[PDB]
Design a protein around this ligand. Structure first.
Ligand code: 5FA
Length: 124
């Protein structure tokens, strides 16, 4: 039983590097975090900040979520992130991805007690 918070960390946290490594980053990262295993997850974002910094976003700027819920929060500071976007030549189980580095405000949905990130909603 993977908690929703643990799943968020597996899907979206990569504190080890400061920015996307190579053009290869998403191909390898989407694979190893088990985001390509039943299918190719079409789009995914990895956040290169400490877990404490990302968790803290749950007390930052409250904003509407894409699905209409009210539990989303935008970071006051920009954060180092990497966007992974499936290519057209990508066919499961050969998921291939374009790797885009950026520094952007992240928007996460938070839930629970303790109140922690459980969904990555957007970057702006
Ligand atoms: N405000 C919110 N609070 C809590 N959870 C919220 C939420 N908004 C959406 N979800 C949750 O995000 C997923 C939406 O699918 P999506 O972003 O459009 O991506 P998806 O097609 O990839 O479906 P998943 O693979 O389940 O994406 P994930 O939920 O696993 O990963 P993610 O939540 O960071 O996108 C569902 O589990 C939904 O309850």
């Amino acid at each position: 039983k993977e908690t929703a918070a643990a799943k968020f960390e597996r899907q979206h946290m990569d504190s080890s590097t400061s920015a996307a490594s190579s053009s290869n980053y998403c191909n390898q990262m989407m694979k190893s975090r088990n985001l390509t295993k039943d299918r190719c997850k079409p789009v995914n974002t990895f956040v290169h900040e400490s877990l404490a910094d990302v968790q803290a976003v749950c007390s930052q700027k409250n904003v509407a979520c894409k699905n209409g819920q009210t539990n989303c929060y935008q970071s006051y500071s920009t954060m180092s992130i990497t966007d992974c976007r499936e290519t057209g030549s990508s066919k499961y189980p050969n998921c291939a991805y374009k790797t885009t580095q950026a520094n952007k405000h992240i928007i996460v949905a938070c839930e629970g007690n303790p109140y922690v990130p459980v969904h990555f909603d957007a970057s702006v």
